[PDB]
Amino acid sequence: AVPIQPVAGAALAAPAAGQINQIDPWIFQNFVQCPLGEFSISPRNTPGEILFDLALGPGLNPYLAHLSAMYTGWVGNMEVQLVLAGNAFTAGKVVVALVPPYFPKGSLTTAQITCFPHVMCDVRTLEPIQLPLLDVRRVLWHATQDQEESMRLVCMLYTPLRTNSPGDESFVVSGRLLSKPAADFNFVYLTPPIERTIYRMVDLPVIQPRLCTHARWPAPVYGLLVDPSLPSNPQWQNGRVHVDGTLLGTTPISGSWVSCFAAEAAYEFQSGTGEVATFTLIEQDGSAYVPGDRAAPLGYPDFSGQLEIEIQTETTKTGDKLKVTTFEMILGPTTNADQAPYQGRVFASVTAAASLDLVDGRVRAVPRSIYGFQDTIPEYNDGLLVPLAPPIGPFLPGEVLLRFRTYMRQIDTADAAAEAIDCALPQEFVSWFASNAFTVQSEALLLRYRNTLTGQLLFECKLYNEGYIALSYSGSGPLTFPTDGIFEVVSWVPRLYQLASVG
Amino acid sequence: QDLVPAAVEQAVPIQPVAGAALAAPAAGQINQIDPWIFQNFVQCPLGEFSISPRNTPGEILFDLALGPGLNPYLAHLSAMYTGWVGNMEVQLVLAGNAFTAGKVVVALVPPYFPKGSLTTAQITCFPHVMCDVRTLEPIQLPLLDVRRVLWHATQDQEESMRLVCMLYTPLRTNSPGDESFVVSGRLLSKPAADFNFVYLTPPIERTIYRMVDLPVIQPRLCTHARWPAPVYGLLVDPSLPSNPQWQNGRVHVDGTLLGTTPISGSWVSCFAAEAAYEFQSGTGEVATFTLIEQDGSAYVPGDRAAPLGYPDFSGQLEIEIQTETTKTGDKLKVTTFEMILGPTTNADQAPYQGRVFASVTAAASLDLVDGRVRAVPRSIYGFQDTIPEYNDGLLVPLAPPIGPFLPGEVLLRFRTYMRQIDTADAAAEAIDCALPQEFVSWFASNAFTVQSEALLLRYRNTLTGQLLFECKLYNEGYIALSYSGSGPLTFPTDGIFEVVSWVPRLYQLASVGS
Amino acid sequence: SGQDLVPAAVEQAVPIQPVAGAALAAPAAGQINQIDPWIFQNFVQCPLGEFSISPRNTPGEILFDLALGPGLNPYLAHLSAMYTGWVGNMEVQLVLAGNAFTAGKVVVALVPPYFPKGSLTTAQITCFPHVMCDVRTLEPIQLPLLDVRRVLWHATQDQEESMRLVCMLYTPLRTNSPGDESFVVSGRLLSKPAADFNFVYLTPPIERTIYRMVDLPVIQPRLCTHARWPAPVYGLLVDPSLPSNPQWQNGRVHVDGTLLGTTPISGSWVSCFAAEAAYEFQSGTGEVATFTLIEQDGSAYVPGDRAAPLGYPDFSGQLEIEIQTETTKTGDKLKVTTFEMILGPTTNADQAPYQGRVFASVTAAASLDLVDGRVRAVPRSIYGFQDTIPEYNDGLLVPLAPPIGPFLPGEVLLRFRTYMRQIDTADAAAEAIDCALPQEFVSWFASNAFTVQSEALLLRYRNTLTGQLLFECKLYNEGYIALSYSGSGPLTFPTDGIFEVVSWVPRLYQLASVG
Ligand SMILES: [Ca+2]
Ligand SMILES: [Ca+2]
Ligand SMILES: [Ca+2]
């Protein structure tokens, strides 16, 4: 069919392999869906778009991906099926090409796609199109726990779709790809099964949101909502984690480090403000702090306002040795006094008429209350710029951020409403991703929120690699969801995947 | 009885190496090349080198690697294939007198031999040919594909057989007379009978083994890379500092931009910021600028020293920005501000941290509206060619100083003239750059591969085709000329640079004199 | 001769296919190469060919781990210095012929390339092609090592992924003998190449390769130089009554060549310094000299990852030093004067050698007209010597070399001892100072830069005039020597012998007691 030579599999690996291992003959009799092998074609699409691009390897089949954990290597070819869903009143064409292992990745055009060994397929095709996937390589076999260059399968839109549509829908053309191993596929060497393999699917802890911990204020999570009338691209420096396990910003690992800090204190009495203390910050585990590539030590608060803190103070006066004292610090936006957490120094003041003989030493400060709270980053430098984390985004047209909401301890005189603060992910998910260290596949994960008892689906969402969730919402007023569901992982989806609208 | 001849010819013995026979079962195709490419020796892209009496025994004269980068035909054909396999054959010619004494050795070094420092005793332990600089005829060697893989990838340069040349004995002339005599050497190659390509792909022009070229524009029709003005002069001057530390107009040959070099020539000595004004009652209007990028993005302190295109010299600068007033009768105008670049003690300038100050004297209290401004240069006062106050008084990342040069080489400078305020003298103020604009471009638009340490270029007159000088373009973006005089020497600016070949670091240029 | 034990593990089937060797690499080489046919005909001891099994080991401990390649044979390790490439299989012999009053089991497995190194628990070692062996076996057990690979040959100067041979203690070793001790098993490893082993491409013979096992200088300890005080080495001893983990800063060197702490290269830099001196006359203590320290070759000193300049003293007490001075009076130009220096913390130390700042004083009535300049100070006397690190920073922390250790239970440190010149009012006993290695060994290691293999080296100390081996010791890769001694008093040895290298050993090796 295509202009290519036959490729030898185990006949080339056998002399230098230790064993050649066989696979269940029933696996050779079933075509299974490939991951990321599906697309939709619209009348508004332009020729030259990539529909799918899949690389040869064990990860194309769930059974082979499972079996990969007890072996050292693999060899051989596969066979794939393409299924298109059109009818007799359509027009258009696609091209499927065979790209060799070491072709420089980039962007192709319709002119260049026909210079590979390819097949041209019409949209009106009834039967599935069957293709081979051959193992072109410069080695004798591949390693299971190490991904190398392989032959690829790339699909492009060649000639556009011409159709009629009704007044309510638009008639996309759907395509799916399935695959199975060929008669010349083998594994190499029996090894003890490994649990931390690279073909391991991402999962989430089975915990309800109402039992979790907020990642920006030390309080239980009280709400879960989307509100389009709020800044769509916030720049919070806490609660930022990557799916592969990389912490971002000033995010700590433990929930007891949130909005607290540790330092060394020096107290002195000024007949003006009262008693002032200059804290030289360190890490909460006792290690030293070096100003590097983040705005502050791990866990430092990332909002603006006037904060109250308690520390353990020891006075050398007679009849008294230990107590707990509450100070008052200013961390609002550009407030009049030289606050440099980035350099590692802060100032606090307390009201006093005499000198309280407080001995200096190591101090850990935790928050009490906030006055004049704003959702803006604090004054890390006097007026200078600081290394930060990029704002959350971007979102597709019509996508809104999902927020986990809790309430803080306020100080106020005129108003009596609650003080709401939101985060992107709860603190348990941060530690889950840090301790699991999965392998990222494409751009995002598809999730499902469901009720534990009745098994009822509530909405859909997308979990991006950077660690934020997006919903397809078209309203204006805030929408609130129950906090007794469970999040479940479905599959890997591309960035341009269209969610089902909620509300 | 049996006779042992005293003079035997040469010809290193080999064992045949298999090519497409080993690669056929696992490749998709085996592609044939034209049968007449096997019949001619053609100059390699790296096919020029020199030998001088200043060279010492043990120095490496050239080092070639097996592959499609040794033949222009094979390098042209590699653009539509994914792999290659097979052997080659190399030829060498030298141009000497009968007054020159000296010996060199050409050895075959296998892959995975450590790349440290060979000596004269070790070089003869490889399969080799011994040559002397008085030979009239060319000398040829084979190049076999000793490898652990089935074939090679044309786009990734792996380890293969090498061809290294070393100076075995010193170069001596009996009576010196011309002690500056240089021996020229050239290299040629062709494929051997067992060479093939692998997989037919579409032809991609932006591939490796594509030869570097330069835009066909005369230097006087170009834009200066450090001050927004046309290029007016082109010279060399040994009385100026040898290794400047300029930050603009610096780009790697492979396309990497160094320092704060921008892509467009309208970003030079300009900046974009958010402006907040105030009226300190003593001096006048004072403006605080929070710096951003000139395309509207956000500036983040990273591995640079300032936003792209920020001025990299000293003095006091006049700038113009658009201002909107809140007064009655006027809406918009252009206002001139005075700024300090050179550090003395004051103004606590920190473009690296993103905050800049400017001022303008005024008895009134003009109520300008805070907003977005773009500042462009107007005039310079007290110009000095030293990097400005980047941090307050601290150290920031910087591009390395230009260099090094071989003994006798000097830097080629493109010169333009600035607009200055000077109440004492009427002499023009000149500023130099290493590469002009449209040369910062054409790099990172084309992504070339270096294949060597330097490029040889010839400067020519558009008509009458006269050669003016020769120069070496180093991989770091500066041009060197062989000049030994004491004062400045200028050149006409209606020429065209042309690419000759890749040359090593130790290449010796023909001297330039007035 | 009594068959109270198992004669052979001669045949347990190993589930593996035959592997092709040099036949796949012949069309890819440009030469014809061959190994001497007589090398293929006898079994010789591996460079790592000795190991121990003790009744103190627990199941799951790894006894030996051998990687396939030209480092398992002395002939092949010598031959690999003049080649680029190797390929083939090998045969190994294991000797475990313990006493008939013993019991235990071990497992030897074939671990493929690319399997992660690390844990290898006792549960998963039987999931490989393996063989189970008794410690009483009379005959040597013969095992194959095959070249499972996806390339055509391997580079000799690089260490790549190949099949390994791992031996783990499966059951504890016990003796049912009617008195007073349990036996230790001494196992041996031998190797030879298989039929299709070869090399690839002839290369200039270079001595400094990754192989070439470590050597030692042929010098008697009594003819060497002490590495912590400028004096000859006088004693060689072990003493369990002294601190077991000293934190000396001088004389520390890694077997691979890296110098640790403030160890200088030359022996003339020890306990000396060089500085720029400023002189003043204080109406109290007399003449005070302030020294700003530099390097001893004239270079500049910058406080980095060391506590002091190279060769600075690393003990405490009052040190008397001699210095060269010039005066601007009449009738006297140059002389040598003695200064006193406080090295200890003493809760009052303006000195901070970590910042290049020291002071000394000399009693004087009238100000001697001494001129400033550059000076070098060398030691003369010690008073109130204490073997503790000085106050590098007046009260703060400085980077330091780690304390010497750890040791196995029953292992003590071997010390090279010299004597210092002291001032004393009522006691006339000599004052002694110890070091771990002499300066000649430091220079040897810094100049040779060997490649280490597993964890340590086995050494044997012979006698020159008799040819008698006196003891055996373990030289750890970090640069200290441990003996197995269980006495209470000190034990000294003659200082007219030569150390020699035997084999590579792990940290679990059990030494014989002395003496
Ligand atoms: Ca409120
Ligand atoms: Ca002027
Ligand atoms: Ca004493």
Give me the residue from B14, B22, B125 closest to C27, CB to CB. Answer: B22
* Residue B112 burial (10 A CB sphere; 0-12, 13-18, 19+): buried
Q: Which residues contact C177 (CB under 8 A, 6 or more apart)?
A: C101, C183
Asked whether residue B325 falls in the same domain as residue B449, the answer is no
R_g (Cα) of chain A, nearest Å = 30
> Which domain-ending residue is among B384, B409, B439?
B384
The verdict on residue B509 lying in a domain is: no
> Distance between CA atoms of B359 and B364, rounded to whole angstroms?
13
Residues of A in contact with B449 (CB under 8 A): none
User: Which of A2, A12, A102, A148 should we substitute to test contact with B (largest number of B Cβ atoms within 10 Å)?
Assistant: A102
CA of C229 to the centre of ligand 3 (A): 16
Residues C294, C426, single domain; the answer is no
* Same-domain check for residues A366 and A463: no
Q: What is the CA radius of gyration of chain C?
A: 29
Examine the domain organization and report whether B141 and B31 are in the same domain: yes
Q: CA of A12: which chain C residue's CA is closest?
A: C150
A-chain CB neighbours of B204 within 8 Å are 104
Return the DSSP state at C511.
Answer: P
Q: Look at residues C386, C412, C436 and tell me which one is the last residue of a structural domain.
A: C386
Those residues whose beta carbon sits under 5 angstroms from the ion ligand 2 are B 422, 425
CA-to-CA distance for A429 and B382, rounded, in angstroms?
59
Residue A419 annotated as binding? Answer: yes
d(CA A14, CA B113): 30
Cα end-to-end distance, chain C, whole Å: 30
Reported in sequence order, the residue ranges of C464-515 that DSSP labels E, i.e. its strands, are 469-476, 481-484, 491-493, 497-505
- Identify the residue whose tokens are 């608060």: A301
Closest CA to A312 of A257, A259, A359: A359
- Which run of H or of E encompasses B417? strand B409-418
Helices (H) and strands (E) in chain C, counts: 2, 28
For this entry, resolution in Å reads 2.7
**At which residue do the structure tokens 């222009």 appear?**
B72
Tell me whether residue C15 is in a domain: no
Residue A154 included in any domain: yes
Protein residues placing their CB within 5 Å of the ion ligand 3: C 424, 431
A-chain residues near B202 (CB < 8 A): 111-112, 115-116
Bridge partners, residue A347, by sequence: A278
CATH number, domain of C443, equals: 2.40.510.10
Question: Where chain B is broken, by preceding residue (C–N > 2.5 Å)?
Answer: none
- DSSP per-residue codes, B459-474: EEETTT--EEEEEEEE
Q: Do C146 and A18 touch (CB under 8 A)?
A: yes
User: A295: closest CA among B288, B306, B300, B393?
Assistant: B300
Are C309 and C236 found together in one domain?
Answer: no
**Which residues in chain B have their CB less than 8 angstroms from residue A117's CB?**
28
Statement to judge: residues C250 and C274 lie in one domain: no
* Whether A425 contacts A246, CB under 8 Å: no
CA C241 / ligand 3 centre spacing (Å): 18
Spatial distance between the Cα atoms of A377 and A235, rounded to a whole number of angstroms:
8
Report chain C residues whose CB lies below 8 A from the CB of A17: 17, 148
Mutate to test the interface with A, among C87, C127, C150 (most CBs of A within 10 A): C150
| CATH number of the domain within which C350 lies | 2.40.30.120
Which residue numbers of C have CB closer than 8 Å to A's CBs?
Answer: 15-17, 19-20, 24, 110, 112-115, 124, 127-129, 146-151
- Residue A140: inside a domain, yes or no? yes
The DSSP secondary-structure symbol of C309 reads S
Report in angstroms the alpha-carbon separations of B501 from A31, B213, C13. Answer: 56, 10, 64
Distance B385 CA to ligand 2 centre (A): 13
Q: Which residue has the tokens 């006339």?
A: C428
Q: How many CB atoms lie within 10 A of CB C169?
A: 22
Type of residue at B286: V
Distance CA C149, CA A18 (A): 9
Between the CA of residue B380 and those of A362, B262, B265, B338, B420, what are the distances in Å? 54, 21, 19, 10, 5
Q: Cβ separation of B27 and A115 shorter than 8 Å?
A: no
Is C493 inside any structural domain? yes
From C343, C362, C386, give the residue that closes a domain.
Answer: C386
**Structural tokens at position A498:** 């269209």
Same domain for B443 and B326: no
Q: B17 to chain A, minimum CA–CA distance in Å? A: 17
CB contact at 8 A, C462 and C269? no
Measured CA to CA, the distance from residue C418 to residue C432 in angstroms comes to: 6
Which residues of chain C lie closer than 8 angstroms to A139, CB-CB? 150-151
Measured between alpha carbons, how far is A173 from A93 in angstroms, rounded to an integer? 11
CATH of the domain at A138: 2.60.120.20
CA–CA dist B317, B338 (Å, integer): 6
Give the whole-angstrom CA distance, residue A285 versus residue A302: 20
In a 13 Å sphere around the CA of A248, the CA atoms on its Cβ side amount to: 22
Answer yes or no: do C29 and C167 share one domain. yes
The answer to whether residues B336 and B362 touch, using CB atoms and an 8 Å cutoff, is no
Separation CA A350–CA C437 (nearest Å) = 60
Expressed as residue numbers, the domain containing C360 is 268-386
CA distances for B75 relative to B67, B83, B211, angstroms? 9, 12, 9
Cross-strand pairs, C84: C201
DSSP 8-state code for residue C153: -
Do A295 and A281 contact (CB within 8 A), yes or no?
no
d(CA A80, CA A83): 10
Reading phi first (left if > 0) and then psi (alpha if -120 to 50, else beta), residue B492 is in beta
Give me the number of domains chain A comprises: 3
Q: How far is B186 from chain C (nearest CA, A)?
A: 27
Asked if the structure places residue C4 within a domain, the reply is no
Query: Is A203 a member of any domain?
Result: no
Question: What one-character DSSP code corresponds to residue B72?
Answer: H
Q: Are residues B438 and B307 in the same domain?
A: no
Chain breaks after residues in chain A, where C lies over 2.5 Å from next N? none
Q: Residues B434, B338: one domain?
A: no
The values of phi and psi at residue B39, to 5°, are -120, 0
CA neighbours closer than 13 Å in the CB half-sphere of residue A78? 29
Task: Report DSSP state, residue A430.
Answer: H
Same domain, B366 and B423: no
φ, ψ of residue A49 to 5 degrees: the values are -80, 145
Residue A145 lies in a domain: yes
Instruction: Tell me if C124 and A14 make a contact (CB, 8 A cut-off).
Output: no
B231 and B161 assigned to the same domain:
no
Q: How much distance in Å is there from the Cα of B398 to the middle of ligand 2? A: 28
